[PDB]
Symmetry: C3
Subunit: 269 residues, 3 copies
């Protein structure tokens, strides 16, 4: 029984899209989620909507958000994020189905197993070699091709602490590190999802070229918002078309392996 958590996914909270709408405020051992969970079906697949933020990315309760989705029975989480492009070839409006990250966050709890919550006792060392679910990514990539969307099949997201944008020296340095796109929210979301044994993937939409590029207008909030206004529908279409493909793919082996990975990453006395 697949159930898809959706974070930041535009306006899928729509009666034309979401059937059986049920709003729900939950509490977790880690505090309150960002918003109420919105339950319902989209193309006959059970979904759980959760708005990520009004709140700086540093302060979003990622632990509570992922814990809530897990407690609701989510097997998958698909997030949508804006991002800056650090590569000429990734143009504003392009989608990037990211497959790696580089952590530049500093203030963020990255584990449920922190020694202070005995629903998560012990110490967890989760592998991150492949942080994003390969099968989900393959469906996203294939669906984007069918929809005719400008889409990159891989890429490394650098997540900065924020809320400030990067300096130019930082932007150039991230390029030398191998980062392709830049944002403020992928970490620790992706990490906590893996700890919970959830298949996690991300739809990243480039909105700007950060500030590395000597021939273009540097990033600002208005530049980001403008590009999203002109392009956000692409991400919504990809997500809507992808959901039923996920609903009719087989997952029991994938989910079993994720469960084992999560389980055997925990050390106990």
């Amino acid at each position: 029984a697949v159930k898809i958590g959706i974070i930041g996914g535009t306006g899928l909270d729509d009666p034309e899209i979401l059937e059986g709408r049920t709003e729900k405020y939950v509490d977790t051992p880690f505090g309150k989620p960002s918003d109420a969970l919105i339950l319902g079906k989209i193309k006959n697949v059970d979904c759980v909507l959760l708005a990520r933020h009004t709140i700086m990315p540093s302060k979003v309760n990622y632990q509570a958000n992922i814990w809530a989705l897990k407690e609701e029975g989510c097997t998958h989480v698909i997030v949508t994020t804006a991002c800056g492009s650090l590569r000429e070839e990734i143009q504003p409006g392009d989608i990037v189905i990211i497959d790696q990250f580089i952590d530049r966050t500093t203030m963020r709890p990255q584990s449920f197993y922190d020694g202070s919550h005995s629903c998560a006792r012990g110490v967890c060392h989760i592998p991150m070699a492949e942080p994003f679910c390969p099968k989900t990514r393959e469906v996203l990539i294939e669906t984007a091709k069918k929809l005719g969307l400008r889409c990159h099949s891989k890429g490394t997201m650098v997540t900065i602490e924020g809320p400030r944008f990067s300096s130019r020296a930082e932007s150039f340095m991230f390029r030398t590190w191998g980062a392709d796109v830049i944002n403020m929210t992928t970490v620790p979301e992706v990490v906590l999802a893996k700890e919970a044994g959830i298949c996690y993937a991300s739809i990243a939409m480039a909105t700007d070229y950060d500030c590395w590029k000597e021939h273009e207008e540097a990033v600002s909030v208005d530049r980001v918002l403008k590009t999203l206004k002109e392009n956000a529908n692409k991400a919504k279409s990809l997500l809507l078309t992808t959901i039923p493909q996920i609903g009719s793919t087989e997952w029991s082996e994938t989910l079993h392996n994720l469960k084992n990975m999560a389980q055997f990453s925990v050390l106990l006395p």
Copy 2:
């Protein structure tokens, strides 16, 4: 009406320099500043002096309170003076660097006023940092340093480390490969918070050592830094003293208007 905040600026708190001296302890929504604000005029320009460390590790300095206080006092400009390590042979101890970029290696530091818990700063702020330091102020600093005959570098990238420890040699080498030219512990988040407050911020960095990336020279220590400052700190003081009246007689309204707009339109509201 220009008013210049001055942070770490040697001994400008001197009756021969500062006229109308008024000491002042303030409180902010972010807690107490590092020290009392010293108000007065230096060469006919309103100035506000603020010691950065009062005895306090760079990690613990209340940067938010410091910048908020200067903003609340009407400061349009902030000029900071900092010691730094050189990561380049050409930047010798005693040289001044008018930095134009930074690389953040800090970890513990709030970098925004708009943190969701202070309703003098409601919403979320994503301040642009493509050009973190005020270009016009930097141009005045550069031109003034040339006139004073000072060894001065017109640009450079400051890496700011968390501290209070110095860097390892592997860290020092890595920072060179990243494009950093000098290294310190205080530029971030000061520069960031000043931009959020719409203040024209510039920095005078004085190289005091070569960090530890030369295996064939004396590595940095507190005594090496103090020795170089003893032999050279007057250069930074002279630059700052000569610069203040040039800032006082430059036109700023367009520069300040653009900073204000940038700050204002970086804020997202519900």
Copy 3:
């Protein structure tokens, strides 16, 4: 009078190895250490032996306790991932540098809230690991026939998660040779306390930078330690008496001066 703090050093707490065994629970201005201190002699040398994510270990209390007990030296043993083909699982690396990728960790005793440590301390880190101790480790490893690398840069990550593959590749480009979660701030605090610090790092995996091999997991690390941990124990046991009969007064005097003159006061 040398006294050697030993951290993570396998099972040296053995009556066949450790003589005047005295268990001891201490408190410090920084809170409780990770475990009780086990005092005793190993060969003829006074030693102090010393569930929680690496982020939460009370490194300040641990190092303060060892200092307060009179330790002149600290030798730590650590597992680590290898970021270089030539450093194979089971190899020992006598590390000589680090790169800090931690974020949550106090790295100083002189934090403005403890007046056993008043002022601000800016400790030099050009040479974070004691050269003489490292030379003894290297020479002893050669005598024991152990696979050993005479230098290496440890990147210490915050954890508790392992690194992503993009992170692993990036660390290679930065010059890191091995990767762990505990060297920083341990090495830093030891230098502040004027203690001669060295590290025995044992590679347990290749992290995840090979796209054609099994990535690191807890079970891969545990398996390699089961097959190899005795090497680190042997190195440490054989090294202790060499440290006990080396002269240290100049080395310790210079460390003491460095620590002392790194402190700024009002």
